[PDB]
Amino acid sequence: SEIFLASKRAAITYDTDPATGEPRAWLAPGGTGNVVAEQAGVLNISWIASADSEDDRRASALNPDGVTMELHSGREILVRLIRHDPAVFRNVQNFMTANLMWAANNYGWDRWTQPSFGSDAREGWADFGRFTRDFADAILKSSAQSADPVYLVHDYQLVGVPALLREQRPDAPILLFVHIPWPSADYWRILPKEIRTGILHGMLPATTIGFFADRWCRNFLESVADLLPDARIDREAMTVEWRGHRTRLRTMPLGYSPLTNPQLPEGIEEWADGHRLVVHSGRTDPIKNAERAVRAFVLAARGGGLEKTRMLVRMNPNRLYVPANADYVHRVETAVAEANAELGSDTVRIDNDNDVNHTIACFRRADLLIFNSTVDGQNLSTFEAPLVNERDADVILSETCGAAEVLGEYCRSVNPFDLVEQAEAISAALAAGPRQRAEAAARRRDAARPWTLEAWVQAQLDGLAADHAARTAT
Amino acid sequence: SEIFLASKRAAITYDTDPATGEPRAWLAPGGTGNVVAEQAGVLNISWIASADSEDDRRASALNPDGVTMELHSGREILVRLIRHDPAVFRNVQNFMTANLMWAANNYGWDRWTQPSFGSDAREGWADFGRFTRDFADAILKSSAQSADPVYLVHDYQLVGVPALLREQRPDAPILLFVHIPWPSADYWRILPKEIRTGILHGMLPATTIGFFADRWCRNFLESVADLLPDARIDREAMTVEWRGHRTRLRTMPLGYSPLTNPQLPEGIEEWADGHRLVVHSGRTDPIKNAERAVRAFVLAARGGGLEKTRMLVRMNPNRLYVPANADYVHRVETAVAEANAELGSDTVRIDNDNDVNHTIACFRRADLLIFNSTVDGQNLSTFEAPLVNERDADVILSETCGAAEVLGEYCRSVNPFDLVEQAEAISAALAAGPRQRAEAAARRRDAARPWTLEAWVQAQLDGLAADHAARTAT
Numbered sequence: 024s025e026i027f028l029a030s031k032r033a034a035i036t037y038d039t040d041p042a043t044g045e046p047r048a049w050l051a052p053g054g055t056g057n058v059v060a061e062q063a064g065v066l067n068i069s070w071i072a073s074a075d076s077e078d079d080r081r082a083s084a085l086n087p088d089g090v091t092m093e094l095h096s097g098r099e100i101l102v103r104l105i106r107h108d109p110a111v112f113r114n115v116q117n118f119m120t121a122n123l124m125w126a127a128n129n130y131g132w133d134r135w136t137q138p139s140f141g142s143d144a145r146e147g148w149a150d151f152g153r154f155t156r157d158f159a160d161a162i163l164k165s166s167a168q169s170a171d172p173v174y175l176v177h178d179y180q181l182v183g184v185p186a187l188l189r190e191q192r193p194d195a196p197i198l199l200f201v202h203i204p205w206p207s208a209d210y211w212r213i214l215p216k217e218i219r220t221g222i223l224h225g226m227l228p229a230t231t232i233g234f235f236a237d238r239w240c241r242n243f244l245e246s247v248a249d250l251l252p253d254a255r256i257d258r259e260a261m262t263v264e265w266r267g268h269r270t271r272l273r274t275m276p277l278g279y280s281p282l283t284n285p286q287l288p289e290g291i292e293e294w295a296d297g298h299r300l301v302v303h304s305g306r307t308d309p310i311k312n313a314e315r316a317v318r319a320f321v322l323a324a325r326g327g328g329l330e331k332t333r334m335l336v337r338m339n340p341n342r343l344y345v346p347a348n349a350d351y352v353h354r355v356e357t358a359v360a361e362a363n364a365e366l367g368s369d370t371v372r373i374d375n376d377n378d379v380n381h382t383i384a385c386f387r388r389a390d391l392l393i394f395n396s397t398v399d400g401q402n403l404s405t406f407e408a409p410l411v412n413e414r415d416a417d418v419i420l421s422e423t424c425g426a427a428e429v430l431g432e433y434c435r436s437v438n439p440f441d442l443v444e445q446a447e448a449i450s451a452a453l454a455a456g457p458r459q460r461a462e463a464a465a466r467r468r469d470a471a472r473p474w475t476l477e478a479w480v481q482a483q484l485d486g487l488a489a490d491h492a493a494r495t496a497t
Numbered sequence: 498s499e500i501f502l503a504s505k506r507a508a509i510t511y512d513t514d515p516a517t518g519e520p521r522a523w524l525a526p527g528g529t530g531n532v533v534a535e536q537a538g539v540l541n542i543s544w545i546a547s548a549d550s551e552d553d554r555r556a557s558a559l560n561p562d563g564v565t566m567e568l569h570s571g572r573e574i575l576v577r578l579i580r581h582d583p584a585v586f587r588n589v590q591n592f593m594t595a596n597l598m599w600a601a602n603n604y605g606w607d608r609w610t611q612p613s614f615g616s617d618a619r620e621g622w623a624d625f626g627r628f629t630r631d632f633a634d635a636i637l638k639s640s641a642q643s644a645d646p647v648y649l650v651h652d653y654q655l656v657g658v659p660a661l662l663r664e665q666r667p668d669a670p671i672l673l674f675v676h677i678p679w680p681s682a683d684y685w686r687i688l689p690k691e692i693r694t695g696i697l698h699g700m701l702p703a704t705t706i707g708f709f710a711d712r713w714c715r716n717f718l719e720s721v722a723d724l725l726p727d728a729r730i731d732r733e734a735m736t737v738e739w740r741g742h743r744t745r746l747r748t749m750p751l752g753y754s755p756l757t758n759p760q761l762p763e764g765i766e767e768w769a770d771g772h773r774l775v776v777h778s779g780r781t782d783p784i785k786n787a788e789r790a791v792r793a794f795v796l797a798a799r800g801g802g803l804e805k806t807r808m809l810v811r812m813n814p815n816r817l818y819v820p821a822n823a824d825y826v827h828r829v830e831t832a833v834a835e836a837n838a839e840l841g842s843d844t845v846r847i848d849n850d851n852d853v854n855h856t857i858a859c860f861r862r863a864d865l866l867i868f869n870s871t872v873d874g875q876n877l878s879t880f881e882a883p884l885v886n887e888r889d890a891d892v893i894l895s896e897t898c899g900a901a902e903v904l905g906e907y908c909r910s911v912n913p914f915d916l917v918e919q920a921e922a923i924s925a926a927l928a929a930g931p932r933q934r935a936e937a938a939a940r941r942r943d944a945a946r947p948w949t950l951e952a953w954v955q956a957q958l959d960g961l962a963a964d965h966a967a968r969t970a971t
C-alpha cells in the first residue's frame with residue numbers, strides 16, 4: 024500500500040534554527056500528507072507538488088527526486104517539488120483565479136456581459152495542458168519503482184492529471200478530490216468547448232472523484248450527460264461509464280482539524296467591549312459575501328433592537344491582484360462606509376490582516392456568526408467557529424455552502440441573495456434567548472465535531488479502496 | 498370542447514374605418530387564439546388578457562363580459578380584457594422585466610454582485626399574487642356556464658394561474674405554456690424562498706406544462722426536486738407527483754407562422770451594395786448577444802478575407818426603460834463604434850427601428866446570419882430567416898437557443914460566450930462555397946419548415962388531450 028499524494032502546494036516552512044543558524048525545512052502539521060502517513064493501511068507515502076517560492080525552487084534543485092521529511096512517530100514522507108516553466112506556471116495560476124476557472128466553478132459569470140473568451144483562454148488551456156504533463160510525469164517518475172501505487176490527487180489544478188496517470192498505470196487506483204463546487208450543466212457549459220470537454224476527459228479515468236457535497240457530484244454528472252454522448256450516468260449509483268472507465272463519485276465531507284488562546288486584532292476588544300459583536304470571516308474572495316452581510320446588518324438595525332451591536336468583518340488577504348478580489352474588497356468598503364454613515368460611526372469595522380490566530384479569537388468573541396457565502400465548496404470556518412465559541416453564538420450559514428448538507432438543520436439557513444431574509448435572521452438570532460441559544464449551540468457542536476480532517480482522509484482511503492475493488496471487478 | 502385561452506396580451510388593432518370614420522377594433526392574424534378557433538375539436542373559444550392600452554381599458558369597460566370578435570370562416574372568438582389596479586399592473590410588469598423575473602429565467606445574474614433582493618421583491622411578489630387572482634377570476638368568471646372547460650394558459654406572467662384554476666375546477670384540463678427558458682436548479686434557487694417555491698406551487702396543478710425545449714423541462718424538474726420535498730420526479734417520463742397532482746411536462750417546439758416583399762431600412766441597400774452582409778437581429782434584450790457578435794466579426798476580419806464584408810445589427814426597440822436593455826444597447830454601440838475605428842469606417846451599422854417588414858427584408862439580403870443568443874426560449878427568427886433567404890445564407894445559431902434542438906445539426910452551432918469560435922465560424926461560413934452553401938441551405942429549410950405555428954397548437958391540443966385522459970385515469 025504504497026501511497027503517492029499530489030497537491031498544488033505542499034506546506035513547507037523554511038527558517039533558520041534559532042540556535043544553529045542553519046537553514047531549516049519542515050512540514051506544517053495537518054497536513055493531509057502528514058495525516059495520511061498516520062493511517063492503518065499506509066506503508067509509505069510520497070508527496071508531489073508545485074514550487075511557488077524560490078525557497079521551493081532552491082530546495083528542489085538540491086533534491087530532484089525528492090527530500091525525505093520526518094514528523095510523527097519518527098515516521099517520514101518523501102516530498103518532491105516540481106519546478107515548472109515559470110512563464111507556464113504563472114499563466115496557469117491566473118487560469119485558476121477569478122479571471123477564468125474560479126469564476127466557472129464558483130458562479131462568477133453573468134452570461135449577459137461575462138464571459139467573453141478570446142485568444143487568452145486558448146493559450147491558458149494549452150499551458151494547463153503543459154502544466155498537467157509535468158505533474159503526471161513527476162508523479163509517475165516518483166512511482167516507477169512501486170508495485171501497487173495508490174494515487175491521491177488533490178486541488179482543482181490537478182484535474183487533468185488522472186487521465187495521464189491512467190494512461191501509464193491502468194490498474195492503479197486513482198482518486199481526484201475537488202475542494203470546490205461544480206456548476207450546473209448550463210453554467211459548466213459556458214466554457215469554451217475544448218475546455219468544458221477536456222476537463223471531463225481528464226477527470227473521468229479516476230477510480231473515484233470525491234466532492235465535498237452531494238450537489239457538487241450531481242452537477243458534475245449532469246455535465247457529463249450534457250457534454251459526452253458516450254457517457255452513461257446512474258444518478259442513483261453515482262457512477263459514470265465512459266470509454267471503458269468506471270468512475271464512482273463520492274461525497275466525502277470535511278469539517279475541521281482539531282490539531283489547530285489567541286489575541287484579538289488591534290483594539291478590537293476595546294472596540295467590541297460593551298457591545299454584542301457580529302462576525303463575518305473569509306478570504307478576500309467574492310464568494311464570501313460580506314457586502315450583503317453588511318447591508319443585511321443594516322436592514323436589521325433599521326428593524327430596531329440593534330442598539331449596542333457591532334459588526335466585525337474579518338477578512339484574510341488573498342490574491343488581491345485578480346480584479347474580482349479587488350472589486351469585492353472595494354465593494355465591501357463602500358458598504359461598511361455607508362452602514363456607518365447611516366447607523367452611527369464605528370459601528371462596523373473591517374480587519375484585513377492574515378493571522379489565523381486573530382480569526383480564532385474572533386470566533387470566540389462573536390455573539391453572532393455569519394457565513395453566508397454565495398457558494399462554497401465546503402467552508403470549514405463554519406464548523407470551526409461553533410466549536411471554539413463559548414458565547415453560544417448562533418450561526419447564519421448559506422444554503423449554497425457545502426457544509427449546509429451537514430450543518431444546515433442545526434444552523435440558520437438563508438438564501439444568500441436575500442437581504443430581507445438574512446436581515447430577519449440576524450435579529451432573530453439576537454432576539455433569541457441565552458438558553459434557547461445555549462442548547463442549539465450544544466447541538467450544533469454535536470453535528471460539527473465528528474467531521475475531523477482525519478476521518479475525511481479515512482473516507483478517502485476506505486472509499487477508494489472499495490471503489491478500486493469494484494473497478495477491478497468490473 | 499369549449500376552450501378558454503388566456504394570454505398576457507391579446508393583439509388587437511384599434512383604428513378608424515378609412516371611409517366610415519367609425520372606430521374599429523380587430524384582431525391581428527396568427528394569432529394563437531385565431532388559430533385555435535381554427536382546429537378540429539374546437540366548438541368555441543374565449544380569449545382572456547390584460548389591458549395595457551387605454552384603448553384596451555376604454556373598450557373593456559364597454560363590454561365587461563367580453564366582446565365577440567370575427568375572423569376566418571366567419572368564425573368568432575369572445576375576447577375578454579382585464580383592467581387591473583393600474584398601480585398593481587405597472588408593478589408586475591417591472592417584475593417580469595430584467596429587473597427581476599427576466600433575469601431569473603434568462604441567466605442575467607452574476608451571483609457575486611447581483612442580485613440583492615430587498616423589500617421591493619416582497620412587494621412585487623405580493624402584487625404578482627394579486628395580479629394572478631384577477632386572471633384566474635376573470636377566466637373562471639368567463640367559464641361559469643361551460644360544462645367541460647379546457648384552459649390554455651400562456652406567457653410567463655400567468656404562472657400562478659393554474660393553481661387558482663385547479664382550485665375551482667379540479668377536473669378541468671389545464672395547460673401552461675412557458676415561452677422562456679428554465680434555469681438550472683442552482684440558478685432557479687437564487688430567488689427568495691417565497692418566490693422560488695411559490696412559482697412551482699402555482700404551476701404544478703396543471704395537466705401539462707409545455708416548454709419549447711427539452712432542456713427547459715429538465716431544468717424545471719430539477720428545481721422541483723431541489724425545492725419540494727413532497728414532489729417525486731421521473732426524468733424519463735417527464736412527470737411530477739406532488740400533493741395529488743400529476744403533471745406532465747412536454748416539449749412542444751415552435752418555429753414560425755407562414756401566414757406572415759418588404760423594403761430594407763433607409764439607405765441600407767446602397768450601403769450594402771457591393772458587400773457581403775452579415776446580419777444579427779433581435780430585440781433590445783441582453784440575451785440576443787449582439788455585442789459579442791460584433792467583436793467576433795472583428796476577430797474574424799483580423800483573420801483576413803473579410804474585405805468588402807459589412808455587418809448589420811438589426812435591433813427592435815423594446816422596454817428600453819429597464820437598465821439592462823439600455824446598458825445592452827449602449828454596450829453594443831461601443832462595440833460597433835470600436836469595430837469601425839479599427840477595421841474601417843461604416844463597416845458596421847445598427848438599425849434600431851420597430852418594423853417587422855424591415856427585418857424580413859434584412860433576412861432576404863443577408864449573406865450570413867447570426868443568432869448567437871446567450872440563451873433563448875426558442876427564437877423564431879432563426880427558423881424564419883432561412884426560410885425567406887435566397888442568398889443561401891449560412892446561420893450561426895447559439896447552442897443555448899431552444900431552436901438548436903431542432904436546428905442545431907443543420908446550422909453552425911457555437912458556444913455563445915466564445916469569441917474565438919464564433920469568429921472562426923464567421924469566416925468559415927464566408928469562406929464556404931456557393932454550392933456547399935446551396936445544399937446546406939436546402940436542408941436547413943427542410944428542418945425548419947415543418948414547425949409551423951399551427952402544428953405547435955395542435956401539439957398543445959393533442960398533447961393536453963392525451964395527458965388529460967391520463968390524469969383523469971390516475
Ligand SMILES: Nc1nc2c(ncn2[C@@H]2O[C@H](COP(=O)(O)OP(=O)(O)O)[C@@H](O)[C@H]2O)c(=O)[nH]1
Pocket residue numbers: 306338339340376377378379382383399401402403404405407
Ligand atoms: N491564512 C489565514 N487563514 C485563516 C485566517 N482566518 C481563518 N483562517 C483559516 O483558514 C481556513 C479558511 O477556511 P475555509 O472557509 O474552509 O477556506 P476557503 O477555501 O477560503 O473558503 C480555516 O481553517 C480558517 O480557520 C486568516 O486570517 N489567515
Ligand SMILES: Nc1nc2c(ncn2[C@@H]2O[C@H](COP(=O)(O)OP(=O)(O)O)[C@@H](O)[C@H]2O)c(=O)[nH]1
Pocket residue numbers: 780812813814850851852853856857873875876877878879881
Ligand atoms: N415588432 C417587431 N417585430 C419583429 C422585428 N423584427 C422581427 N420581428 C419579428 O418578431 C419576432 C421575434 O422573434 P423571436 O426571436 O422568437 O422573439 P423574442 O421573444 O424576442 O426572442 C419574429 O417573428 C420576428 O420576425 C421588429 O423590428 N419589430
